[PDB]
Design a protein around this nucleic acid. Structure first.
Ligand code: MG
Length: 386
RNA sequence: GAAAUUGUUGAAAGGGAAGGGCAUUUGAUCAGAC
RNA sequence: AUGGUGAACUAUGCCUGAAUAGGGUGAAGCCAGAGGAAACUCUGGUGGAGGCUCGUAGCGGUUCUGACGUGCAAAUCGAUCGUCGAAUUUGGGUAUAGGGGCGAAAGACUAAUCGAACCAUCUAGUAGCUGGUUCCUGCCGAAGUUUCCCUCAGGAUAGCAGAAGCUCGUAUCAGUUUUAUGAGGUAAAGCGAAUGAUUAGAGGUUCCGGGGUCGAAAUGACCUUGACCUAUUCUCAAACUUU
RNA sequence: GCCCUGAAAAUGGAUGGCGCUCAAGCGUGUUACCUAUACUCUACCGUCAGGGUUGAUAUGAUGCCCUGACGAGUAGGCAGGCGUGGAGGUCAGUGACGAAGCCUAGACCGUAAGGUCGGGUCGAACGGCCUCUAGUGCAGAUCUUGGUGGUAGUAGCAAAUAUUCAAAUGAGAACUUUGAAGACUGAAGUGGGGAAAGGUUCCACGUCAACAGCAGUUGGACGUGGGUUAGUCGAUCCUAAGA
RNA sequence: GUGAACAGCCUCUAGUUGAUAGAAUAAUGUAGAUAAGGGAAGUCGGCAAAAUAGAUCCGUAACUUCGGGAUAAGGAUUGGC
RNA sequence: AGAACUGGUACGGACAAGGGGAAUCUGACUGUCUAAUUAAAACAUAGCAUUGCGAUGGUCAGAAAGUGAUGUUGACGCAAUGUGAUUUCUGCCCAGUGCUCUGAAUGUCAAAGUGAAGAAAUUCAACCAAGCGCGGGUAAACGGCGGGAGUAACUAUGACUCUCUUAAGGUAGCCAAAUGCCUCGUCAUCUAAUUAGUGACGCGCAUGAAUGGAUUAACGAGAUUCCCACUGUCCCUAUCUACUAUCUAGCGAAACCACAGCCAAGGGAACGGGCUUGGCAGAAUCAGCGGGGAAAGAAGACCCUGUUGAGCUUGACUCUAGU
RNA sequence: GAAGACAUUGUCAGGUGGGGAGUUUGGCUGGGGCGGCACAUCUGUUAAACGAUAACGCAGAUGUCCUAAGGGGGGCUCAUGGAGAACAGAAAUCUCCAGUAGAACAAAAGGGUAAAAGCCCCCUUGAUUUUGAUUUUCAGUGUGAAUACAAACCAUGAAAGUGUGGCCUAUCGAUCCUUUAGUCCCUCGGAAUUUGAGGCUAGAGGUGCCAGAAAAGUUACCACAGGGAUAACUGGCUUGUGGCAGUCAAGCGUUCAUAGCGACAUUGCUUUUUGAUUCUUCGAUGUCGGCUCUUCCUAUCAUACCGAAGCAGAAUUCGGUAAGCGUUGGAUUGUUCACCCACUAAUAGGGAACGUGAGCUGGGUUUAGACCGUCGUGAGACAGGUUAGUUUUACCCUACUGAUGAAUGUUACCGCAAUAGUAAUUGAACUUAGUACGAGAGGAACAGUUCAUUCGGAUAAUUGGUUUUUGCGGCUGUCUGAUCAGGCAUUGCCGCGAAGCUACCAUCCGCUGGAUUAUGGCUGAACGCCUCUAAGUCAGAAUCCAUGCUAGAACGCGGUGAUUUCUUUGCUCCACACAAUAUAGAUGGAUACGAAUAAGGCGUCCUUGUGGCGUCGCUGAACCAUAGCAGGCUAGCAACGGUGCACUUGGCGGAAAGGCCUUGGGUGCUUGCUGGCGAAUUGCAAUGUCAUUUUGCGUGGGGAUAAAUCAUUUGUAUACGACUUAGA
């Protein structure tokens, strides 16, 4: 017999299975479509989630109640030092999908990048690209052939970059390596662009520009094993239920004499890879720029880092991207920032966002002051002071 | 000093049972006859 | 059915013991005072009654239909709860014994056993009902049908089957055809044939159907309706039929 | 005539499936080819039937031989055989130079029941044949008694607030002893005595195979012993309900 | 000792420190709890839980077998010195 | 008992410790019972009422007895019943089934005893105890309280009158009550909305007087309705603690088990793990889970059958203790 | 003292006697009960032309009736119609004609019957006596009925003859007992007589459950052996009924059959009603409802796009593609159902063992307690009402959710993408616009903007919740002599309280291309016209497939880095040296345009094309290769070609290129032609061994000198594994 009353099902069936991701760095499964008319540019970037903070800005949209009037807003800061270009890969178009024809690497690789190729770095002769470096030191013999291989073939060209994880306060010491597809033109000069950028850093301002919609790709915060009530949002069973109430009462009919794949059940929650879209960049901060957190309306010399530092992350001495809202992943997590895959006017994505005030109060409590100078003025002199 | 049941060694087979029948290949072993 | 054993659990009586904070309320009896046309009424003390009451120990066992539910436990555990000075609680002694006890009465309890305890014997109690019923090969090979039965899940009986054969040796034979001779009432057919049913008009007769017209009426006449008769017409029958 | 509309049901799915469009569909016709335990021939087995052959030697005349036909089977009937315990007869049978039993993807016979042999183990009895006799053959009866698995190194060993440090002993210490620290019962006690009941559980010494669902050097365990002193405390006497 | 109290809580005498332990802190359980705004809409049903609660002062209805109802209902106070 | 002062308005500071109100049904109350699914409206109870009996007795026990209980008793008692405090009331019916009384009896009637016939066994006849039958009493015995006809000046109805069955015809009260089918009865009230609730209306299938009727303060771990307060019951969930579950050392079971364990459809004992046609199909596994294994727990307690029972009842059949 | 031969005591007899005892309280049967009798029977039919033949199949009948309605005989002819007669008519009685039964013969019906079998008159008991045979049913038993006889005694009639009950087919009863008639016989057993009794043959009393016990209920306190031979769930066959849908078109609709409806008929579908049945299940598949959750169907309520109107607008009605997406909060009731209140775009219908009880609950139903009404004498009964009433077990397999993991030389990093899944949804306000339209009333829509509902995925800056941060403070009781500082009160209590977790109770985000359905069109035949259709084709829906999003096949794949010698000489590549290993199956060559097939291939020519001319196919049965000891050893001739082999020059090919072409020289052979030598004996065939897979051990010649795991450690992770970090 039918349900006596209707209700939408709990949870989304397109995000199945709710298993753990295969890696801590979510993979980019689609890059922006290429038109061979623009200059050569990276389409993505690698950064670390620093934390949340609060922004005040003047909303500008006609027809709204809050037009030309203040709105307090929530943003998240992603810490983005420049990425070092080491290597390039060509992809031939085959009837069985794209396939990497060959990889050409740079002559010199730092320590922090070659640590990626090791499980035990403290036990090593460290033997990394030692015989590959001998491919260089010739005039024009070796490297140019595989480079010309990517010229003659490989309709898709991607660039291997590694993050400067030593500049961030993270205690990892082991960089993150990824392919970022080049979406310039004339794949021959895509290969040329990667050639003279070997061992050279690409800053975030050359990829993302302020007031842009970008994509955040990261692995979500994990919560271990979860009951069905929280994992799927099912209704809680009544109080006087024998043998538990954080369950699903009927997990199937008599026929088919099986449990279907679509019935909510207990298991892993979180640590999924997600691609959230349409996040607007509110600031492209400069690492070597005092008063990162300042604004034309504030004009007070203060960096983006709140008093006491970003909770569980540290400080933002490097460049950063301030993007509106919330993104998948927790603090200290590697996050990939991707360009929008389509063009949207939307009367909301073309708005020019000009900040007015950035919150720098402590996130380690009910923060009261924005700067140590502000705290000293309000309170006065203390007994600690001499 | 049996069987169920068990250990060790040896041999063989095993993609959601195993076991069986006809026929033969292959491997192991063997009687007769000269 | 016979003969025994149990009131160490529990039921009720009797005998002899034993146990039961601290509060609330404030009955009779008693003292003093006040108002008083008397009569009498009122007030404050005192006192400490009640199968009274809140609530411990105790005795109990309402709800969570909680825990447990191959338990700690063949009835327990937690919380909540009833009663708590007596128709109270309880020990020991003793009385009551199975168609019998005891019962503030639930068919309750009478040793985890009760709408008739337990033990042994009669007793291998009876069952048209359930289950099982042990080696091989060869040859043959059924029935669910008849009649009777308090007969319908059973028997008896005939039949179907096997075995032993017996007397004879191709015949007093045959789940067949032919010839000759009978019997039958089904299929079909039939209703201008009996019975019954059933459509339509045509022609006739009323001293004797009902009506309208000319008539006082006529066994007077005219038009119509009903039956009646004749020759037709359409359609039928398991309990209709010549064939 | 074919095709289409008419033509709506619940897990995904059924010309058997793939798939097939002058078909690999439908109607129709003509040949070729495939294959049943069916039909023809042959061999072999048994059963039934009809016959031949005592003649001397050689023993089964219930024997040997010739001919023909036939063979499914539940319940059931009949017949011929295999095996077991024991008894009469006989093989002047086998055997401590190894009987019986047990084990053996080694050999042989029989359609089969079964029979025989070889090898290992073992240690004292046992068979062939003709007969006699029966407590004579198992896969099952929620069969009886005994034994053993998968489950499975699994459920579990979570009520009662709580342990820690060090030394001693020992093969071995979370658990024994001692010290120290931290706690609890909180006087209707986790204290000190008894009644009923138990019977040595009391105490010492030695001691850990078993029991204390971990452990164990410890124990209400195990082995060996010691220990209960009345004129006054009880019984002993009286009587009660009763016997 | 607190306190009306052989209540509940703490301590003295006396006696125990007995119940397999160790490591982590997933889901779901058992037991104990707290929740913004709403306040029975939940459910057969307020089942469960919550609220009230000691004492002192004030005040106390219908009805009544005149004994009760009654701690009715409803207010105030509460430490230390 | 009172007064100052004092504090982050706190102070029965932990512990301890009534939620309250308006109503309906029902039992008066306290008390008792189904040990181990029912604590109740059940039982008890006081009070009320009835019945039997003066001892050669009532009631009861016993195989029997020179036997017993009440009884060491004596109607202000003993035995047997019904109802169930108080208040109020307990209406009509003795035809029936009972029970109980007169016996004034051509009714019936045993054994014995008597008479006649007989040759006797025997047959016949009259007579005849208790009992039945006949005739009275009794309902706080068991119980019952129905039709019909004619009538009042609008109809309707019947204060009045008569009549059968079979004796009487339901009075005082109470009711969609725990007793009403129809029924979710109709009206009012309560709600935004009520098959609930309360108050009313009645030819009431089938209310009703110690089968007790009605009312009723107090009480109730009894059934029900609503209001205030209060809250995680809920909107709609979230978080925390202990012990588990989890991993380890030691110790270490049970249920159950034809063989086993992937589906779809088909056909099939009409719902397959196995069969057919398909889809498929990769070792070894861990924590969860409750779809399935028509999972497990019991030779269905329901139904039916059986010439199988038992407990109980009675104008069943056949007997019997006692009297 | 009382009583007194009465009580009492003993035996026999009558009444009373559920206090007690034992027992019984039919059968068939579309389950049982109620009902009925299909139980003993009879007629017609079913019944299918001998006989037989079932059903609780159809129309009925019997437990009797008759001294004549039995037996014999004689005479007459019936029902009815027509015509006539005083009262007298449709029915009185009388006359004639007609009249095959259309009457009667007890009853039920069917046969039969006309000088009778009918109606009237006469006589009588043949409805008698004796035992046998036979038919029916059948067992060739009994019982009943009957048939024809034999031996007596009669009736009637002139006589022939008829008469052994009823014109035929129903109309009935064993054993034991009692009783009667007959025989007046046998026996009473030590011998007699007489009563009495027992025997012998024929009747009567009766069993209707009728081949034949002597028999009341109840059980909700219950028991046993069984039954799925038999009911109450599901499921299966069926579909009357329920529900849904068609065809026809008399009519309604002012007018007008079909805008919307639609009578009388009729044809279907479904299994969400209820029936009918009894196949499975009674050594048990847990029978209401709700809650929870998933999925499926379409007969579509809303949302998308459309067609038709009795569509001016608005609102609405009919219909199509469509199940992508939604379909609620409540009062009462256990309720399913129902009925109201209210919101909403809408509050559609259903299935999944009437889904879902080792998921819950337990309000209802349906054990045992209890009350009432009604019924019963009673025990008790009631699909009447009411109140209280134990809801057990997963640790196994599979499924599902998550999680590891051997083996693909090792190890590490970066990737591809087969397959599977998928997602967004709906409303409001402003403007368009008081506009279009309409006499007026009234009154839209596309485009645009701002928000909101339902859903989903994350996240913690802020706000709120949570407190063992037992972090700070405060307070009570007690304990530590007081102070300070602490313990205990199972987290003592209270206020605040960071971090983490977390709330539509907080915030953010949720994409655009193609192909289509219905539908509306273009060109254009069929059908000289016309037509959206046939060929061809355009636009088009919340639809499908893509983009995008999640996982990554643990037996799908690519690129890249490093690859161990003093673990006692290890690893890799190259040449041969010998072994082992195995074969989804060499035995001359897998021999390369593309495109069309109502058209092409090749050759040639020009003015280079969609060109002209010529030729070819009609199968690869082709082309190439192919002679020599399983293919030997030598000689010459002719040309300077052919082939194999190791080197070498230069290119081309990345879809899995791993192969193709080419320059130069050397070398072997050459069957292009002509000579010389050898073969035997494997005995007359025996595959008669000539291929390539992998691995190992040796040489000699180059090439290069790593990691991973455990353990420790971090928390961006976590049940354990696993993950992510760090450590010379
Ligand atoms: Mg005066």
């Amino acid at each position: 017999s039918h349900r006596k009353y209707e209700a939408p099902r709990h949870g989304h069936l397109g995000f199945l299975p709710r298993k753990r991701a295969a890696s801590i760095r979510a993979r980019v499964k689609a890059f922006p479509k290429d038109d061979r008319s623009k200059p050569v540019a990276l389409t993505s970037f690698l950064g670390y989630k620093a934390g949340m903070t609060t922004i005040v800005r003047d909303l500008d949209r006609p027809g709204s109640k809050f037009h030309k009037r203040e709105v307090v807003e929530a943003v998240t800061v992603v810490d983005t030092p420049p990425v070092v270009v080491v290597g390039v890969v060509g992809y031939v178009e085959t009837p069985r999908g794209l396939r990497s024809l060959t990889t050409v690497w740079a002559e010199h690789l730092s320590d922090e990048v070659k640590r990626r190729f090791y499980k035990n770095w403290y036990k090593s002769k460290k033997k990394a690209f030692t015989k590959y470096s001998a491919k260089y030191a010739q005039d024009g013999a070796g490297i140019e052939r595989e480079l010309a291989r990517i010229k003659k073939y490989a309709s898709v060209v991607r660039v291997l970059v590694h993050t400067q994880i030593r500049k961030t306060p993270l205690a990892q010491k082991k960089a993150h390596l990824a392919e970022i597809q080049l979406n310039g033109g004339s794949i021959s000069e895509k290969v040329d662009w990667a050639r003279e950028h070997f061992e050279k850093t690409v800053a975030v301002d050359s990829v993302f520009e302020q007031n842009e919609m970008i994509d955040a790709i990261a692995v979500t915060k994990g919560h271990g094993f979860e009951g069905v009530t929280h994992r799927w949002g099912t209704k809680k069973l009544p109080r006087k239920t024998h043998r538990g109430l954080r369950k699903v009462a009927c997990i199937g009919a008599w026929h088919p004499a099986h449990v279907m794949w679509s019935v909510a059940r207990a298991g892993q929650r979180g640590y999924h890879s997600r691609t959230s879209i349409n996040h607007k960049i509110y600031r492209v901060g400069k690492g070597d720029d005092e008063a990162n957190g300042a604004t034309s309306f504030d004009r007070t010399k203060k960096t983006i880092t709140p008093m006491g530092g970003f909770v569980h992350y540290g400080e933002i001495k490097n460049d950063f991207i301030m993007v509106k809202g919330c993104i998948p992943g927790n603090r200290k997590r590697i996050v990939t920032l991707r360009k929008s895959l389509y063009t949207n006017t939307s009367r909301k994505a073309l708005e020019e966002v000009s900040l007015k005030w950035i919150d720098t109060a402590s996130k380690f409590g009910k923060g009261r002051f924005q700067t140590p100078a502000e705290k000293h003025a309000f309170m006065g002199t203390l007994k600690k002071d001499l």
